[PDB]
């Protein structure tokens, strides 16, 4: 529903297109139910406006040879106003056009080859009947008389659209022939199809920028105020400038790009003139978008800036934003990788109220980025882009572009024996065979250093219930506590009881506390933010009191979310618990945590889960009803659940049929899930060593597990068993004394 | 009494108005007891000056068809100088007016439709008898001869008020016809009726700005000094600029708006000239208001500023404020969202002595904001604005405007199938059916991120005595301790004993310490500030020694107030109590608390309540007679009070008649109120799960409570019972050793 602006299904005005049995660009295919169903008379030349402000023209009425009804062109339009199937192109006539001047010869490379003579009677004499060359700026067509392999481009025209040429016109002979790079920048221009992994953010940008500008009457009639300040933020390299470049040519509004450093590079006084002229030029054209890339470069915080020119620039920008009234229809867009460094006076109502978060893409998002970036390369048949997307975790769009570049370079290194640096040229038999293979991508992955490794990942974890053995009661309770209020809120307000927002996991280590938190988020298809104990202790010593703010509201914007606080014992160990260092477990950090969970409304879908291995040193303040009142105990797996844990851990391992998992389950009494995983890993290491030794078979046999069972260490002692058991019944007693 | 300037009841010069049986704008209704009761002779044309500096004119003496005595017009004046019923419009004649020039034709859209010819004999020939078109700048009237559906506006006039036109006048033909947006900004101009939730602050602003300016003689005769500096402060987006815009057109004084960033955006030297010219222009006109929006932008603290131009600006502003003597009648108003960032030299006597606090509106306040903002939209019939106001808690006026915008956008997204982006227009059958429904508002509420969530809410809590089970003795004591000195202060000075200002709540956790503090504030209709333990520990580590100042005086200005200090054990746990970390519970923070409660006068209505679950680790210094000498013990609920607690918790739940609450009360011996609430919540979860399972009935039955009673955990142990009991008698012994 939120991305409804990007949906094109169930449209009766669209159809599928197939291959063409003919190979002639001069012909077009028509249909009776697409031409005789309206009032389009038999015109001479009609325009065909597709996407990216590009149109095309050909000879109409060139059909009644192939099938009717459905429409189908050749494959030459694969690079002309088309990138994929399923596009609706609005066809509309344009009669009563004016008459323009003529255009002289504009050769490219047709003089140093063959004979030329005059080069005038090969494109104007044979094509003058009912066709006066409806040329336009951006039209590419093939016309000649010697080999039919050269194109021609026009730059001389009085109006913007096409026109009918007329003879007997004087042309000033000062036209310089163009090079190749001037037109090669145009076809590969950035569009909406070059953005990968930002489907959700693109819908928001379209509905708050393009919609208020193309249809201001819709927003005016409904009595609403269209937002005039949009701030794109995210980690560096996520594609903020790419969206700017995409909307700079995919929108029918006057675009004005303002670079951050470019403004700040000017002298004192000359920079404010640039901002004033930019806003004045935008105000002149009613459809207008202003993009201020690198907003943090020109608008830092006025309480920690140094120079006076920066403060004057910030005040000038604030005045310019406030001075835009309603009738101008000017939308100011900005992009920064440091949204917290923006002056707070700018992220206020009426200036930059709207904020779009371009976060790190997930595996599905980055697969699309890889496909977009490799769409112009030549891959082999063994490349698996899904595998590359899965392996990359902290990678952003820039990181994926760098990875593709490194993979391409690795392919070049492999063919250095054939290429000669001292040679004037290199054979074409090795261009066409130069393909990037999967081993090239693996090598690039081996030393790709991602730039978003430290960033908190907000995604849906891949850990399902299948990865967790046993613990059915905990699964049912977690479902009834998280999945229930998010799918059936009507059952909760009827009974008048607010859902409990908060669960604490406690028990012996290595029992599935992290797996349960990830699985409950995976089943509900909700976001999951995992913040560990030591991560909070490191993140605060830099005297940053607001470092829990951007992680608590990060969950809030990603609703529904599961905010997991793993390894709380590490935090609690920093103060000793009851007496410790004099102060309780309520040290500098968790007090912020309690303040933040107290401030979150109960109607929100953000769920908070905490896990600890040391329930004796958690402060009682976190158990208060309203924060983490739900105390779910995670016991050691028993006879029945150990078989399930082993089966879950051995799902990806070729275990032979003779392995009796029940016997190993019954032999290990006080073994946690981590101990069983360690047993399986030791068995696999034994199998790997056996295979390597026997190389100078690829199945885990009974003896492999028998040998690994000998060294199996128990992680939880008998005394810890009784302590955890007596603590599973008296944890809520911690509040009071 | 404080808002007496906004009261209009018991006025004999007012009456109610009903609908009109006639539909003719050219007629007006008169009455004998409203026309023959004064000395108004039978004039030709009389003005009718309403509100917002707007007046209207029509043909007088057009009655004696409908009923007399009472007055009633048509519904066409619903947008002309009227927004609601109950308005008194001062009627006064204006004879001996001068004669002005003429006005040429000012067409709008009457040339591209129909026939025009001359367009002169359709508004001047048929209307010249005893009516010379008393036109004025801002008059809208309907006059034509073809369809009577076009209006006309004048801009050409020599004087300000209306005049009698005279023929044979030469007009310079240079008048450019006006567009639509130039007049569309005027009717929707901000007025006093566009302010929601600031009824109290508007009365203060009117009585310290409009009153001293409209009637300086009243202030001079009484021998008082009218304040000449008003500072509006509050959280961002609360409506400070909106009040500026409202007083800019609702007051009969020369308004001069000074923007903060607009001054600071000028060059060195040019900014001071702007301030000097602004003050000079204000001094020229005796009724004058100067508004300095974003005062913190131009007047930061001189001890932590960086540039010299800022210091020069601050000194110039100080000199300009001090240079205003008494006879100028110039009132300087300022608005900032950071009142603590203002230079302290400016918030002194004679400069900005008066301060008006525009805080976050309550539910009633924000309901009015929602009504004001949706007054121009088209809602459905299922929308409940009271529900939206109740659900929004940390929302301010800007947040509510954004929520309304998001709700309107959600409505547009639902109708994307009918609207066509490629179409040149869209059908009018979907404008009129485009209504925002309640589910649209629910979706907008699901991800509205309020900007005032961290702000300390100062409101009257909704927790009444009905929400608290039992504890009648504590209720009576709290009444006799808080409600008594605030309603009957005469009974206290007679006996000569000062009321005890301070109560400490101690006892086992989950017994109603927070509920009692909220209920005692709700019954007395007093404000309530809840500051928790961890909130104080987080709020101080940023090395902010003045962070308890703005919360203690916040209670002082909101008198009567109940300053609640909940979860004091979390504060006391930060030092260990008796020995702990060597220091006692008197750490960095509570020493400020004791200093602040020592400084508050006993005649104030601010009441301080503290609550703790660990009375063994509170320092004795807080129990000193004069701070929290009243030690109210909150015991565990007994047989009799548990039934009341269950009834209070089950007031909003459909419990069946077969549930015997006395039996569950007698079965749970050492159960706190939180334990009973948890039992009820578990029973409701069981009922919800049963209903969901049976879906593939909506009443809590006996078995639901029987099952939930099995897992009911006791929160307070037997040892804690005896410790709390022995501590309930010897808490005052803590002072001394
Ligand atoms: N979603 C994406 N889809 C496709 N290509 C992408 C995407 N994100 C990034 N890229 C590529 O990576 C490059 C990184 O540039 P940008 O991310 O646009 O720069 P930026 O977003 O302004 O971040 P900075 O420069 O560090 S502040 C882009 O120019 C693209 O080539
Ligand atoms: N119930 C289980 N089913 C399957 N594997 C499990 C289970 N419990 C633990 N494991 C294994 O043990 C690893 C650690 O799981 P965690 O959820 O992190 O345990 P924990 O209770 O959080 O304690 P630690 O301190 O994190 S080891 C998992 O990655 C699994 O390999
Ligand atoms: N009480 C209110 N009644 C009606 N509309 C309101 C109210 N408060 C805010 N608004 C709306 O929300 C917008 C917020 O703008 P303002 O609050 O006036 O700006 P501000 O008060 O100067 O706060 P800043 O700009 O963050 S310092 C207003 O323009 C109104 O549209
Ligand atoms: N007397 C009571 N009547 C009804 N509900 C109660 C009562 N006492 C406690 N509760 C419930 O328990 C919850 C907690 O109430 P509080 O006043 O916060 O208890 P407390 O004494 O302050 O101890 P904590 O640490 O806050 S749980 C309330 O929201 C109610 O749901
Ligand atoms: Mg950029
Ligand atoms: Mg873990
Ligand atoms: Mg303002
Ligand atoms: Mg409490």
Short mmCIF file of N, CA, C and O in Angstrom, two decimals, chain A residues 24-68:
data_model
loop_
_atom_site.label_atom_id
_atom_site.label_comp_id
_atom_site.label_asym_id
_atom_site.label_seq_id
_atom_site.Cartn_x
_atom_site.Cartn_y
_atom_site.Cartn_z
N UNK A 24 13.45 -4.68 -39.80
CA UNK A 24 13.37 -3.43 -40.56
C UNK A 24 12.94 -2.32 -39.62
O UNK A 24 11.79 -2.29 -39.18
N UNK A 25 13.86 -1.40 -39.33
CA UNK A 25 13.57 -0.29 -38.43
C UNK A 25 12.58 0.70 -39.04
O UNK A 25 11.93 1.43 -38.29
N UNK A 26 12.45 0.73 -40.36
CA UNK A 26 11.59 1.70 -41.03
C UNK A 26 10.11 1.40 -40.86
O UNK A 26 9.28 2.24 -41.24
N UNK A 27 9.74 0.25 -40.30
CA UNK A 27 8.35 -0.14 -40.18
C UNK A 27 7.95 -0.16 -38.70
O UNK A 27 8.78 -0.33 -37.81
N UNK A 28 6.66 0.05 -38.46
CA UNK A 28 6.07 0.00 -37.12
C UNK A 28 4.85 -0.92 -37.19
O UNK A 28 4.27 -1.10 -38.26
N UNK A 29 4.46 -1.49 -36.05
CA UNK A 29 3.31 -2.38 -36.01
C UNK A 29 2.14 -1.65 -35.37
O UNK A 29 2.30 -1.03 -34.32
N UNK A 30 0.97 -1.73 -36.00
CA UNK A 30 -0.25 -1.13 -35.49
C UNK A 30 -1.27 -2.23 -35.19
O UNK A 30 -1.02 -3.42 -35.40
N UNK A 31 -2.43 -1.82 -34.70
CA UNK A 31 -3.51 -2.75 -34.41
C UNK A 31 -4.84 -2.01 -34.47
O UNK A 31 -4.93 -0.83 -34.11
N UNK A 32 -5.87 -2.72 -34.94
CA UNK A 32 -7.20 -2.12 -35.01
C UNK A 32 -7.71 -1.71 -33.63
O UNK A 32 -8.13 -0.55 -33.48
N UNK A 33 -7.70 -2.56 -32.60
CA UNK A 33 -8.18 -2.14 -31.28
C UNK A 33 -7.25 -1.17 -30.56
O UNK A 33 -7.49 -0.88 -29.38
N UNK A 34 -6.20 -0.68 -31.21
CA UNK A 34 -5.33 0.33 -30.64
C UNK A 34 -5.26 1.60 -31.49
O UNK A 34 -4.65 2.58 -31.06
N UNK A 35 -5.86 1.60 -32.67
CA UNK A 35 -5.86 2.76 -33.55
C UNK A 35 -7.26 3.22 -33.91
O UNK A 35 -7.54 4.42 -33.90
N UNK A 36 -8.17 2.28 -34.19
CA UNK A 36 -9.53 2.63 -34.58
C UNK A 36 -10.47 2.81 -33.40
O UNK A 36 -11.66 3.09 -33.61
N UNK A 37 -9.98 2.67 -32.17
CA UNK A 37 -10.80 2.82 -30.98
C UNK A 37 -10.82 4.25 -30.45
O UNK A 37 -11.47 4.50 -29.43
N UNK A 38 -10.13 5.18 -31.11
CA UNK A 38 -10.12 6.57 -30.67
C UNK A 38 -10.31 7.50 -31.86
O UNK A 38 -10.65 7.06 -32.96
N UNK A 39 -10.09 8.80 -31.65
CA UNK A 39 -10.31 9.81 -32.67
C UNK A 39 -9.02 10.24 -33.36
O UNK A 39 -8.93 11.38 -33.84
N UNK A 40 -8.02 9.37 -33.42
CA UNK A 40 -6.77 9.70 -34.09
C UNK A 40 -6.96 9.56 -35.60
O UNK A 40 -7.11 8.44 -36.11
N UNK A 41 -6.96 10.68 -36.30
CA UNK A 41 -7.09 10.66 -37.75
C UNK A 41 -5.78 10.20 -38.39
O UNK A 41 -4.75 10.08 -37.74
N UNK A 42 -5.84 9.96 -39.70
CA UNK A 42 -4.67 9.49 -40.43
C UNK A 42 -3.69 10.64 -40.65
O UNK A 42 -3.73 11.30 -41.69
N UNK A 43 -2.82 10.89 -39.68
CA UNK A 43 -1.86 11.96 -39.77
C UNK A 43 -0.65 11.59 -40.60
O UNK A 43 -0.55 10.49 -41.16
N UNK A 44 0.29 12.53 -40.67
CA UNK A 44 1.52 12.34 -41.43
C UNK A 44 2.68 11.87 -40.55
O UNK A 44 3.36 10.90 -40.90
N UNK A 45 2.91 12.53 -39.42
CA UNK A 45 3.98 12.16 -38.50
C UNK A 45 3.49 12.37 -37.08
O UNK A 45 2.97 13.44 -36.75
N UNK A 46 3.64 11.34 -36.24
CA UNK A 46 3.21 11.39 -34.86
C UNK A 46 4.40 11.08 -33.95
O UNK A 46 5.25 10.25 -34.27
N UNK A 47 4.46 11.80 -32.83
CA UNK A 47 5.51 11.58 -31.84
C UNK A 47 5.18 10.37 -30.97
O UNK A 47 4.04 9.92 -30.89
N UNK A 48 6.22 9.84 -30.32
CA UNK A 48 6.09 8.68 -29.44
C UNK A 48 7.01 8.94 -28.24
O UNK A 48 8.20 8.63 -28.25
N UNK A 49 6.42 9.51 -27.19
CA UNK A 49 7.19 9.94 -26.02
C UNK A 49 7.18 8.84 -24.97
O UNK A 49 6.14 8.52 -24.39
N UNK A 50 8.36 8.27 -24.70
CA UNK A 50 8.48 7.22 -23.71
C UNK A 50 8.85 7.73 -22.34
O UNK A 50 8.09 8.49 -21.73
N UNK A 51 10.01 7.33 -21.84
CA UNK A 51 10.48 7.72 -20.51
C UNK A 51 11.85 8.39 -20.61
O UNK A 51 12.50 8.38 -21.66
N UNK A 52 12.26 8.98 -19.49
CA UNK A 52 13.54 9.68 -19.38
C UNK A 52 13.62 10.87 -20.33
O UNK A 52 14.70 11.22 -20.82
N UNK A 53 12.48 11.51 -20.58
CA UNK A 53 12.38 12.66 -21.50
C UNK A 53 13.00 12.34 -22.85
O UNK A 53 13.73 13.15 -23.43
N UNK A 54 12.72 11.14 -23.37
CA UNK A 54 13.20 10.72 -24.68
C UNK A 54 12.02 10.24 -25.50
O UNK A 54 11.14 9.54 -24.99
N UNK A 55 12.00 10.60 -26.78
CA UNK A 55 10.96 10.20 -27.71
C UNK A 55 11.59 9.61 -28.96
O UNK A 55 12.80 9.69 -29.18
N UNK A 56 10.75 9.00 -29.79
CA UNK A 56 11.20 8.36 -31.02
C UNK A 56 10.16 8.57 -32.11
O UNK A 56 8.98 8.83 -31.84
N UNK A 57 10.62 8.46 -33.36
CA UNK A 57 9.78 8.68 -34.53
C UNK A 57 10.15 7.67 -35.61
O UNK A 57 11.31 7.33 -35.80
N UNK A 58 9.12 7.18 -36.31
CA UNK A 58 9.32 6.29 -37.44
C UNK A 58 8.15 6.49 -38.41
O UNK A 58 7.35 7.41 -38.24
N UNK A 59 8.06 5.62 -39.41
CA UNK A 59 7.02 5.70 -40.42
C UNK A 59 5.80 4.93 -39.91
O UNK A 59 5.88 3.73 -39.65
N UNK A 60 4.68 5.63 -39.76
CA UNK A 60 3.46 5.00 -39.27
C UNK A 60 2.75 4.28 -40.42
O UNK A 60 3.06 4.48 -41.60
N UNK A 61 1.79 3.43 -40.05
CA UNK A 61 1.00 2.66 -41.00
C UNK A 61 1.89 1.76 -41.85
O UNK A 61 1.96 1.92 -43.08
N UNK A 62 2.57 0.82 -41.21
CA UNK A 62 3.49 -0.10 -41.88
C UNK A 62 3.24 -1.53 -41.42
O UNK A 62 4.18 -2.25 -41.06
N UNK A 63 1.97 -1.95 -41.44
CA UNK A 63 1.56 -3.21 -40.84
C UNK A 63 0.57 -3.95 -41.73
O UNK A 63 0.50 -3.69 -42.93
N UNK A 64 -0.17 -4.89 -41.13
CA UNK A 64 -1.07 -5.82 -41.82
C UNK A 64 -0.28 -6.91 -42.55
O UNK A 64 -0.66 -7.36 -43.63
N UNK A 65 0.81 -7.32 -41.94
CA UNK A 65 1.59 -8.50 -42.33
C UNK A 65 1.74 -9.49 -41.19
O UNK A 65 1.67 -10.70 -41.42
N UNK A 66 1.94 -9.01 -39.97
CA UNK A 66 2.05 -9.86 -38.78
C UNK A 66 0.67 -9.93 -38.11
O UNK A 66 -0.30 -9.46 -38.71
N UNK A 67 0.54 -10.49 -36.91
CA UNK A 67 -0.74 -10.60 -36.23
C UNK A 67 -1.21 -9.23 -35.76
O UNK A 67 -0.41 -8.34 -35.49
N UNK A 68 -2.54 -9.08 -35.67
CA UNK A 68 -3.15 -7.84 -35.22
C UNK A 68 -3.38 -7.85 -33.72
O UNK A 68 -2.82 -8.69 -33.00
#
